[PDB]
Amino acid sequence: PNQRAQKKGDIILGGLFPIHFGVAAKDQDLKSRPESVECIRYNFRGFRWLQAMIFAIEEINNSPNLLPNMTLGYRIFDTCNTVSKALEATLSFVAQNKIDSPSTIAVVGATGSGVSTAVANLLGLFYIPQVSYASSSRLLSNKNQFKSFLRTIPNDEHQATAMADIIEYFRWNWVGTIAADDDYGRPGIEKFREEAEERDICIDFSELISQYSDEEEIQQVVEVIQNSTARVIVVFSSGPDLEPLIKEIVRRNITGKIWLASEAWASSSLIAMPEFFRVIGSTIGFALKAGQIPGFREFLQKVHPKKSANNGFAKEFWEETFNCYLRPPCTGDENITSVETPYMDFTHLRISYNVYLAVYSIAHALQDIYTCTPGKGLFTNGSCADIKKVEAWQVLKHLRHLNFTSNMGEQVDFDEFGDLVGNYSIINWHLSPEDGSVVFEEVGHYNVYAKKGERLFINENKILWSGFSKEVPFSNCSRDCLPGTRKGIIEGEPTCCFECVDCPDGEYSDETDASACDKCPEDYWSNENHTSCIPKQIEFLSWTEPFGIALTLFAVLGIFLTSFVLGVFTKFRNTPIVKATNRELSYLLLFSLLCCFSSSLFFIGEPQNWTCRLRQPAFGISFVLCISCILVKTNRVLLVFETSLHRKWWGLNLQFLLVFLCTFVQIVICVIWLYTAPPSSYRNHELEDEIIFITCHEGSLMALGFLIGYTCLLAAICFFFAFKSRKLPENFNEAKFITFSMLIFFIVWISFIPAYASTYGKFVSAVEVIAILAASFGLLACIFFNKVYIILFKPSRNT
Amino acid sequence: YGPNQRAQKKGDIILGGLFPIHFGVAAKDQDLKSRPESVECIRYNFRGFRWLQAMIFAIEEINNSPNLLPNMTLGYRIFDTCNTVSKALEATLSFVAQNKHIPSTIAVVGATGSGVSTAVANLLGLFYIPQVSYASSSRLLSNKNQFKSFLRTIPNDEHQATAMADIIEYFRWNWVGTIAADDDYGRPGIEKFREEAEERDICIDFSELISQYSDEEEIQQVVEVIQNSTARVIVVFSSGPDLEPLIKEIVRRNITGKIWLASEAWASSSLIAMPEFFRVIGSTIGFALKAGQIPGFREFLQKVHPKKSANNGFAKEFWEETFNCYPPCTGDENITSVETPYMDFTHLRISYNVYLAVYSIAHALQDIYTCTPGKGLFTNGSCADIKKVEAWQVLKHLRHLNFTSNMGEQVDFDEFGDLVGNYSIINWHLSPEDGSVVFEEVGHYNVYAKKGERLFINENKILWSGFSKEVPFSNCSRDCLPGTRKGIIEGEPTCCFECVDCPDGEYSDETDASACDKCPEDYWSNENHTSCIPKQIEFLSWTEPFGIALTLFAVLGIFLTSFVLGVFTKFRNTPIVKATNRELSYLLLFSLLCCFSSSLFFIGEPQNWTCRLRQPAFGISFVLCISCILVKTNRVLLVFETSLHRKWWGLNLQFLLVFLCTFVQIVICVIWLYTAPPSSYRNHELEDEIIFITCHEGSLMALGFLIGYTCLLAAICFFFAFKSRKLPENFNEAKFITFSMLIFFIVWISFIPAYASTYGKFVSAVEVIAILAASFGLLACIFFNKVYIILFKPSRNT
Numbered sequence A: 001p002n003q004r005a006q007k008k009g010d011i012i013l014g015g016l017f018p019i020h021f022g023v024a025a026k027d028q029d030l031k032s033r034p035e036s037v038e039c040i041r042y043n044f045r046g047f048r049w050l051q052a053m054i055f056a057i058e059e060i061n062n063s064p065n066l067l068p069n070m071t072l073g074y075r076i077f078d079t080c081n082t083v084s085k086a087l088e089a090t091l092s093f094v095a096q097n098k099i100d101s102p103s104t105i106a107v108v109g110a111t112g113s114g115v116s117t118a119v120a121n122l123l124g125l126f127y128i129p130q131v132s133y134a135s136s137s138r139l140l141s142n143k144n145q146f147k148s149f150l151r152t153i154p155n156d157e158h159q160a161t162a163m164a165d166i167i168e169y170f171r172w173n174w175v176g177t178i179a180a181d182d183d184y185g186r187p188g189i190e191k192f193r194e195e196a197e198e199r200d201i202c203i204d205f206s207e208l209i210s211q212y213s214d215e216e217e218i219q220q221v222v223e224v225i226q227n228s229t230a231r232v233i234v235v236f237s238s239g240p241d242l243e244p245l246i247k248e249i250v251r252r253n254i255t256g257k258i259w260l261a262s263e264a265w266a267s268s269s270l271i272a273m274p275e276f277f278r279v280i281g282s283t284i285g286f287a288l289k290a291g292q293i294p295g296f297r298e299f300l301q302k303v304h305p306k307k308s309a310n311n312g313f314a315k316e317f318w319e320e321t322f323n324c325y326l327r328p329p330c331t332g333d334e335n336i337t338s339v340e341t342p343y344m345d346f347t348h349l350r351i352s353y354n355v356y357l358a359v360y361s362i363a364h365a366l367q368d369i370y371t372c373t374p375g376k377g378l379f380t381n382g383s384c385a386d387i388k389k390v391e392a393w394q395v396l397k398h399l400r401h402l403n404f405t406s407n408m409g410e411q412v413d414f415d416e417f418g419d420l421v422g423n424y425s426i427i428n429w430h431l432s433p434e435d436g437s438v439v440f441e442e443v444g445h446y447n448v449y450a451k452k453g454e455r456l457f458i459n460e461n462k463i464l465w466s467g468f469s470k471e472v473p474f475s476n477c478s479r480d481c482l483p484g485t486r487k488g489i490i491e492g493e494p495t496c497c498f499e500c501v502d503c504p505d506g507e508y509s510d511e512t513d514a515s516a517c518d519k520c521p522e523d524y525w526s527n528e529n530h531t532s533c534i535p536k537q538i539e540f541l542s543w544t545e546p547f548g549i550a551l552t553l554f555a556v557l558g559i560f561l562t563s564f565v566l567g568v569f570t571k572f573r574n575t576p577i578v579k580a581t582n583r584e585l586s587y588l589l590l591f592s593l594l595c596c597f598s599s600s601l602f603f604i605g606e607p608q609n610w611t612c613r614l615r616q617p618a619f620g621i622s623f624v625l626c627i628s629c630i631l632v633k634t635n636r637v638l639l640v641f642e643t644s645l646h647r648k649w650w651g652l653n654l655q656f657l658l659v660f661l662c663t664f665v666q667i668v669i670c671v672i673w674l675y676t677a678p679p680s681s682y683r684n685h686e687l688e689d690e691i692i693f694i695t696c697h698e699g700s701l702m703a704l705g706f707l708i709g710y711t712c713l714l715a716a717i718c719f720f721f722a723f724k725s726r727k728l729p730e731n732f733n734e735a736k737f738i739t740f741s742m743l744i745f746f747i748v749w750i751s752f753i754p755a756y757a758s759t760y761g762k763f764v765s766a767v768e769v770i771a772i773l774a775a776s777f778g779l780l781a782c783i784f785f786n787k788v789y790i791i792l793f794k795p796s797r798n799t
Numbered sequence B: 001y002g003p004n005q006r007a008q009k010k011g012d013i014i015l016g017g018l019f020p021i022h023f024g025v026a027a028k029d030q031d032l033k034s035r036p037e038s039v040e041c042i043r044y045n046f047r048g049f050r051w052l053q054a055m056i057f058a059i060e061e062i063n064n065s066p067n068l069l070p071n072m073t074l075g076y077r078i079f080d081t082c083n084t085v086s087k088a089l090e091a092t093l094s095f096v097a098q099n100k101h102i103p104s105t106i107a108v109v110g111a112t113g114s115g116v117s118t119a120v121a122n123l124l125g126l127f128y129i130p131q132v133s134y135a136s137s138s139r140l141l142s143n144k145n146q147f148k149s150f151l152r153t154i155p156n157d158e159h160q161a162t163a164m165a166d167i168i169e170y171f172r173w174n175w176v177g178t179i180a181a182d183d184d185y186g187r188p189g190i191e192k193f194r195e196e197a198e199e200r201d202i203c204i205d206f207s208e209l210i211s212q213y214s215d216e217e218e219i220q221q222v223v224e225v226i227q228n229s230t231a232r233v234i235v236v237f238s239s240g241p242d243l244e245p246l247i248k249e250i251v252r253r254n255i256t257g258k259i260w261l262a263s264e265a266w267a268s269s270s271l272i273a274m275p276e277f278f279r280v281i282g283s284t285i286g287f288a289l290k291a292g293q294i295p296g297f298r299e300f301l302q303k304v305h306p307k308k309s310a311n312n313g314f315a316k317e318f319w320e321e322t323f324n325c326y327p328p329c330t331g332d333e334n335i336t337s338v339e340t341p342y343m344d345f346t347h348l349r350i351s352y353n354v355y356l357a358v359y360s361i362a363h364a365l366q367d368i369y370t371c372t373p374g375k376g377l378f379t380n381g382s383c384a385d386i387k388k389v390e391a392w393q394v395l396k397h398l399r400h401l402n403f404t405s406n407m408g409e410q411v412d413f414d415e416f417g418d419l420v421g422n423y424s425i426i427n428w429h430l431s432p433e434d435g436s437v438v439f440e441e442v443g444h445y446n447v448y449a450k451k452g453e454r455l456f457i458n459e460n461k462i463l464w465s466g467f468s469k470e471v472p473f474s475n476c477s478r479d480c481l482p483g484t485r486k487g488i489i490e491g492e493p494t495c496c497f498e499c500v501d502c503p504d505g506e507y508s509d510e511t512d513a514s515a516c517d518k519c520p521e522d523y524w525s526n527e528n529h530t531s532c533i534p535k536q537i538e539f540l541s542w543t544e545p546f547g548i549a550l551t552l553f554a555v556l557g558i559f560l561t562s563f564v565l566g567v568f569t570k571f572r573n574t575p576i577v578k579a580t581n582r583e584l585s586y587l588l589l590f591s592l593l594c595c596f597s598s599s600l601f602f603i604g605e606p607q608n609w610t611c612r613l614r615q616p617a618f619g620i621s622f623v624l625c626i627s628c629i630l631v632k633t634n635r636v637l638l639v640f641e642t643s644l645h646r647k648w649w650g651l652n653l654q655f656l657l658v659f660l661c662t663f664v665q666i667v668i669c670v671i672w673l674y675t676a677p678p679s680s681y682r683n684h685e686l687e688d689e690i691i692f693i694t695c696h697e698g699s700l701m702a703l704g705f706l707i708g709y710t711c712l713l714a715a716i717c718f719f720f721a722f723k724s725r726k727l728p729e730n731f732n733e734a735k736f737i738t739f740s741m742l743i744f745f746i747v748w749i750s751f752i753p754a755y756a757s758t759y760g761k762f763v764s765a766v767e768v769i770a771i772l773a774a775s776f777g778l779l780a781c782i783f784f785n786k787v788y789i790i791l792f793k794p795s796r797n798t
């Protein structure tokens, strides 16, 4: 090639820099002989990088210690960011070696993963160390194929993990990817997709672009972008590979998304245009750790076409800066500090420092060769190498074992994969208030040495979402489902995109975004929101509640009246005037009425086994013995008509036999109940589904049937015998009184039937207990009030 | 100068050539302690030598034919690549040497790889030299902005990934795993396949990359990932050498359940198709290109001999590897006595691609030779001469090449330099005679057909796991029968799920349902939540045994009433017993007719009129009957009531009496018609399964006061009857009427519990039975004695 930066010396290096951005887009129709294509657009950043390399080389040549007597020369070429020019230059590099089947010993060539691979395939064939400064693809680590490649820029797996970490930190799960179609974008987005699907993050679309894409492919890509709902768009590409898509996006006014820039185009001047920043607001990109090169800007300001004989690119540089010709003609007096261009309009050195570091590392390897001591070398017999006759593979061997200190005082040392690691800065795009150009204000940091999970660190106070608002935009497929509801599948959409369905009654969902409703335990139940389990609010006939205290009051006043009549009897015990009747029978009847009044107590509280298991036979025996005694408190016609009949001769104790017979019969059934089917004191849910009710299911139905039959037949026979003799003046015609009492007993039975048979849980027990209480109360009152009245009022009883 | 081993032959025009005679280079890790020298290759690839022989045969056959380029001879400088990049780049630097005594090559044939093709093309296209590859199938070599001078005769691999997705869809699998060689052949193909599968809703469990340089730990991780997965389909997208280590490790660890979907590179490779590996990998279904027919090829393959080959140079090492000589031997053995891939083949696939490439370049040269000075493709319609031909001319003519190959086929490279062909689909079968692996075609993938109608598989030929004959199950979660519905698992993809039972009131009829459905109120989820069968209704029917029994009782009562009526007719005007009010007797009898009729209002389905009249029907019927009975006795109050005599002075006042009482009653009735008539409506809340149809009386006070009125009438009549219960005037009807109202009150009391303690229909049933029994008792007790004394004992004087 003609245009190049050439300088002689004892040792020659090679450089490859993208001075231009691309080649002249034209189709070689092949109707005539094809010739060398000329590049089109200028790139001042590449010229700054070239100046950095030249500065490093000359500064090394000025230092007296590093390489004391030797001198470093160079043959730097231009690649125009394509492969053809790079391979032309590379063939111009290995010419002396090519004649095997000006020998350069090292090449610093970079800025394209594709270009870097294309060069390293050829340089590694002659074992020429190539130290790239910007090639960051993960494919260049396959040291089984790129034998002689080392890069002073970190790899690009950490960057994919960092983008995944950023997406996870802002709590997003619905994104979309876009990648240039070269060796830089594809592996990057593959690694990112892997790490994303690991972290449970869904990806909507995935398109590829390139600077040679025709309007139809870009149209399709813009349609895919527009016809989607994800707001986060991760981009892995370089400036020139993204310019057309961005042109289309800004011409179509797509102004909603959030761009996650990769390292290549995060700081590119092709994309950071004030026109573009309208529709591409809120970008968050990565950047390398800045560096310091003392006196570099002063060297930059010295460039001049006439005073540059080694450098040959200063001519076109001046022609491009001042826009002149060597239409208007140039003069060698212009002021480079006047015009504005990415040449001097920088604040931090990020890639230029990489070039400086690469040149200094190669120089340090050379110096290490210079200061070898025999017997301690790295070659066959621990031998050293002749620096005056140094070869490329020796420099490579020494570079693999290089370990020195940088200018900032950091330990530069290449990993066994030939690459040094480094932290990341995280940049947000801002609009400058005074000028109006884009400005990269650093808002985050990414440490690579720290353990997993604790690497990313962002400072959200500075981030400007769309420049207007101040809150993280929402970019999930579907809004979360608050507690009370649960997730639900959509048939085709990915897992990160669902709908919400309500928990059916009886189940609850406390946490948000739950996969399935939970059924409260039987003790508990759904709330009104189906959010919280509330207790089943169990219920039964309580004690302190008005009904319970009132029934207990009635019972105890019954006991009080009974004890009252007992006291009256005891005070006048020795008076058979009214006690001409069997005083023992009065004893028994009064105590039996006490027991009957007490029996009610067994139907109050919560039903355990004890409670009902004894509450049925309690009333049973009590009322049957009461009715038997009041039956015997009558005429003995059948007894007079009838061992047993021998005992029916004299002695009142025979009457007792009667009761001590019939109750015996009764207790038989009861003891049957004891060991045949005791009433199950158990709970019930089926009746209410909301509140448990505790009852007792009598296991022996026919047994209680027989019991009730026995007591009612006793009642029938006693009532009939009473009525048949209801009009006999036997001491105030007591027969009419006993008819009255047993009649009201029958009324109690009848009017009790409908009550319990047509009421809810607690009130059934309440009505049963009030029925038994009223029955026994009425019977006792009717039997004893006449006698107590006549005794307390008129003690004239003779016949 | 290139390497030492090559195949060189002079001529007017020279063609390039790159073939993988070996399989790789020795693992010599240069510590760089000494000057690194040319690395040497290790294994031998007889298939590569067959390809090279195919190219040489094509060239010499061209040189023998007098039609294509007459008076012209073709030459070649074929080199070896050993399947690496450095060797190919050495050969290519030798190629382009004369460009910028040394021959000037004008066309290069093939690179056999994708990385090798890319490396060679980046350098060749710099000088615009046409490179016609025969086996490079990456999709990246179609970008005609990078590789300006690259055309291939093997189809691009996009359709191959599409066909992988189509195969996976055809057997209905949705849980697979992928493996790809980490080079330019596996990565783009596996990316395209991932995209296509994601389109067709196919979940990918794992995805790993391998290479022939993978150290033991990486293969360890890969095999661990393979074991810990539940998938069975493993889509491998790689070549033989890059897969050999993984297959070694797998057959060492004895993983047998999986099934493999082979890409074209290794679906027919002798490196993997070995019985040892076949005993483990089981069933593989791979692709292959369409065969070709090179006439008279075997007769040229059988002529190879070391001393007879001066132009060829690889024949020496070939003889060595096939005979183990130079244990030196003579050099007269027969090559047919050895079993190597150099002759153990049935169809030519890639060798035909090489033959086609050579013939295509020769045809472009011919087209250049047969110019017409006015129609040349070059400038001003002119064209160049055959004697000073340059590479770019051949490239230009190859872009516009369109000719016919001996298979009667049309060959033309499209705008992307590729060709197009329709794939065969093979399955790995074990030879029942020898034990070697044999590939048997089972299907065909036609790419010209419309999308979705391209794949044809003859499933009767496939052999699953060597013995079985039914498609294996390789889904993630078992497809569960209807009645259940899908349920998300946290973290797992959309192909792994649970399924839970549909709660009642909801149903799911089809497999793979997302949610159940609420049934229409007339229906309900059946026993298995599968179908909304009609929700059963329930009420007192007619043809039900109870209905027919009750209407039988009713018609028997009506018949007894008609009997007593006829008895009255035949003996009307004889007041011997009829001295009483015959008219009021007919009134009571009609009242009993209405009472017996009152049954018909509580039988079937409740309409509005039905119950809205069923209440007042019984109401008025009874109150009228009982009031006429109350007046069918002594008239003390009537006798006591000055203006009343002037009003009636006769029995008419009795009518007045009843036409007062009933009237009062009927008042409430009409009120009920226009305050809250009982609505005939349904009821579900008690069973959620059976519908109950009843009537709700909006005014409880109406029915309350009505029943209170009728029972107080009954009670006052009962008291009045019991008052004078002992007056034997005409058989002492007082006792009969006391028994009447007594049985009435028994009916009332004993009816209360039954209706107040039973399920729906039986409430109305027992109400019917109670009313019928009350009217029965009334009729019987009142009139049985009269009809008996009339029919039996003719003694009527007092």
Ligand SMILES: CC(C)(Cc1ccc2ccccc2c1)NC[C@@H](O)COc1cccc(Cl)c1C#N
Binding pocket: A704, A705, A708, A748, A749, A752, A756, A768, A769, A771, A772, A775
């Ligand atoms: C058992 C029952 C539900 C009434 C019943 C049930 C089924 C029956 C089947 C055939 C025949 C008679 C039956 C009577 N409730 C009774 C129990 O509370 C026990 O309480 C009493 C039982 C009898 C008499 C009285 Cl004063 C009470 C009270 N207080």
Ligand SMILES: CC(C)(Cc1ccc2ccccc2c1)NC[C@@H](O)COc1cccc(Cl)c1C#N
Binding pocket: B703, B704, B707, B747, B748, B751, B755, B766, B767, B768, B770, B771, B774
């Ligand atoms: C209304 C009722 C449920 C009984 C009832 C209800 C609530 C009441 C509230 C206060 C006071 C009395 C009430 C009586 N069932 C009655 C209806 O079937 C009407 O059927 C009759 C009503 C009265 C007498 C007879 Cl012989 C029948 C019959 N057959």
Ligand SMILES: *[C@@H]1O[C@H](CO)[C@@H](O[C@@H]2O[C@H](CO)[C@@H](O)[C@H](O)[C@H]2NC(C)=O)[C@H](O)[C@H]1NC(C)=O
Binding pocket: A171, A172, A173, A474, A476, A479, A480
């Ligand atoms: C979008 O989806 C993500 C994925 O969960 C949601 O992130 C959750 O946010 C809450 C809020 O603190 C965290 O408690 C959870 O830990 C996050 N999920 C997980 C699995 O960790 C995010 O909330 C969703 N965005 C919106 C607006 O709802």
Ligand SMILES: *[C@@H]1O[C@H](CO)[C@@H](O[C@@H]2O[C@H](CO)[C@@H](O)[C@H](O)[C@H]2NC(C)=O)[C@H](O)[C@H]1NC(C)=O
Binding pocket: A421, A422, A423, A445, A446, A447, A448, A449, A450
């Ligand atoms: C990458 O991470 C941090 C910078 O954020 C560096 O580690 C810190 O360095 C300072 C001074 O060197 C120490 O005082 C801190 O203790 C370190 N903090 C942590 C968490 O490590 C680290 O040096 C950076 N990497 C490089 C190559 O500079």
Ligand SMILES: *[C@@H]1O[C@H](CO)[C@@H](O[C@@H]2O[C@H](CO)[C@@H](O)[C@H](O)[C@H]2NC(C)=O)[C@H](O)[C@H]1NC(C)=O
Binding pocket: B420, B421, B422, B444, B445, B446, B447, B448, B449
């Ligand atoms: C593509 O596959 C199909 C069938 O395998 C081939 O197309 C057939 O060609 C012959 C003659 O045109 C017809 O008899 C068949 O009907 C065709 N198939 C159909 C569906 O029409 C074709 O040969 C294959 N492609 C190539 C290049 O050979």
Ligand SMILES: *[C@@H]1O[C@H](CO)[C@@H](O[C@@H]2O[C@H](CO)[C@@H](O)[C@H](O)[C@H]2NC(C)=O)[C@H](O)[C@H]1NC(C)=O
Binding pocket: B172, B173, B174, B201, B473, B474, B475, B479
């Ligand atoms: C594995 O999953 C697939 C779908 O993911 C099942 O195929 C579906 O089920 C029947 C069978 O054809 C069809 O109604 C559906 O259309 C199929 N889906 C598709 C996309 O075709 C397949 O049945 C499952 N495998 C087994 C053994 O059940």
Ligand SMILES: N[C@@H](Cc1c[nH]c2ccccc12)C(=O)O
Binding pocket: A111, A112, A113, A134, A135, A136, A137, A183, A184, A238, A239, A263, A264, A265, A268, A351
């Ligand atoms: N890593 C980039 C190289 C790069 C880094 N920063 C850049 C800035 C501009 C252009 C290219 C770059 C690549 O693979 O291509």
Ligand SMILES: N[C@@H](Cc1c[nH]c2ccccc12)C(=O)O
Binding pocket: B112, B113, B114, B135, B136, B137, B138, B185, B239, B240, B264, B265, B266, B269, B350
């Ligand atoms: N397409 C394959 C080349 C190939 C086809 N068939 C083959 C058989 C053996 C080896 C390689 C091949 C590749 O990209 O690498």
Ligand SMILES: *[C@@H]1O[C@H](CO)[C@@H](O)[C@H](O)[C@H]1NC(C)=O
Binding pocket: A253, A255
């Ligand atoms: C582009 O979109 C924004 C927001 O809707 C709107 O303000 C503007 O008018 C649109 N058109 C142009 C040319 O920007």
Ligand SMILES: *[C@@H]1O[C@H](CO)[C@@H](O)[C@H](O)[C@H]1NC(C)=O
Binding pocket: A335, A337, A338
């Ligand atoms: C012109 O050149 C010199 C700097 O060397 C000085 O006069 C001045 O800074 C320059 N002009 C501007 C605008 O900086």
Ligand SMILES: *[C@@H]1O[C@H](CO)[C@@H](O)[C@H](O)[C@H]1NC(C)=O
Binding pocket: A403, A404, A411, A413
């Ligand atoms: C590298 O150089 C530094 C400088 O002292 C030293 O600490 C270190 O031991 C050297 N070796 C390695 C492997 O870092």
Ligand SMILES: *[C@@H]1O[C@H](CO)[C@@H](O)[C@H](O)[C@H]1NC(C)=O
Binding pocket: B254, B256
């Ligand atoms: C390999 O696995 C299969 C599974 O059945 C088993 O039959 C066979 O014995 C195993 N062979 C070895 C060497 O482990």
Ligand SMILES: *[C@@H]1O[C@H](CO)[C@@H](O)[C@H](O)[C@H]1NC(C)=O
Binding pocket: B334, B335, B336, B337, B338
């Ligand atoms: C090889 O030897 C002769 C010569 O080719 C041939 O006739 C014969 O068929 C072959 N025999 C074997 C075993 O290959």
Ligand SMILES: *[C@@H]1O[C@H](CO)[C@@H](O)[C@H](O)[C@H]1NC(C)=O
Binding pocket: B402, B403
């Ligand atoms: C060229 O293509 C056309 C149709 O595409 C076909 O008719 C013709 O046979 C082909 N060959 C030549 C020499 O035209």
Ligand SMILES: [Ca+2]
Binding pocket: A016, A017, A018, A079, A080, A081, A082, A086, A110, A111, A112, A115
């Ligand atoms: Ca470059």
Ligand SMILES: [Ca+2]
Binding pocket: A045, A239, A268, A269, A270
């Ligand atoms: Ca840029």
